[PDB]
């Protein structure tokens, strides 16, 4: 059940001379198992979670999950 997510990762830890746009703003497909762990990590990093969609799977399915 891959979740399509859109998120930001502003970082005050350092000022980066190399490219940072790629990591800063991104959309990724995160599987259902990973999403809670990733949600907690990005929320801890303090980035704003702009958007979430259920790219694969169905909103509710008792069995037959991906």
């Amino acid at each position: 059940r891959m979740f399509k997510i859109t998120a930001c990762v502003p970082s005050q830890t350092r000022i980066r001379t190399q490219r940072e746009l790629q990591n800063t703003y991104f959309t990724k497909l995160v599987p259902y198992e990973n999403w809670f762990r990733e949600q907690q990590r990005i929320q801890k990093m303090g980035g704003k979670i702009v958007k979430v969609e259920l790219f694969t799977g169905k909103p509710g399915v008792n069995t037959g999950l991906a």
Binding site: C8, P10, Q12, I15, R16, T17, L21, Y25, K48
Partner: protein
């Protein structure tokens, strides 16, 4: 990334034709101006710190933006602002050397509007600042080179706007 030679040969490739004499002429013209492009790049590479400093002082400093609550306030915010100006100038010199705007269009401009709007960074102030950079860098490189650079600076301004 694309350049003048890459653009010419890419157009010929889409045509499915070998290099025409007109295409060779376009390549010759880029070669003719490549000499001036190189020395302009050397000049602003050495003076890049001065250029950013002068532009920041001209428009960004002694303003409510760098005063508390103006989003440029805080040392981290100031460092990020001058870092972005360094990015813009370095990508501008890359585009000027190449003779093509592809690097700006793909590596820089896409997504920059979304990140700036999300963070609250003032795009109008950034456009004003890189405009000031354009004036300073034109003075240092010279008039002909400034024409070559200014188009890429304006390209970045339009992307931000």
């Amino acid at each position: 990334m694309q350049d003048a030679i890459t653009a010419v040969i890419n157009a010929s490739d889409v045509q499915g034709k070998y290099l025409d004499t007109a295409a060779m002429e376009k390549l010759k013209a880029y070669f003719a101006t490549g000499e001036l492009r190189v020395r302009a790049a050397s000049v602003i590479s050495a003076n890049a710190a001065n250029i950013v400093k002068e532009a920041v002082a001209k428009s960004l400093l002694y303003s409510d933006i760098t005063r508390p609550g103006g989003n440029m306030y805080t040392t981290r915010r100031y460092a990020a602002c001058i870092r972005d100006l360094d990015y813009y100038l370095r990508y501008a010199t890359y585009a000027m050397l190449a003779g093509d705007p592809s690097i700006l269009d793909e590596r820089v401009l896409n997504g920059l509007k979304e990140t700036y709007n999300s963070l609250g960074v003032p795009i109008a102030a950034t456009v004003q600042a890189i405009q000031a950079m354009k004036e300073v860098t034109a003075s240092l490189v010279g008039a002909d080179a400034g024409k070559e650079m200014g188009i890429y600076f304006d390209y970045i301004c339009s992307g931000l706007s």
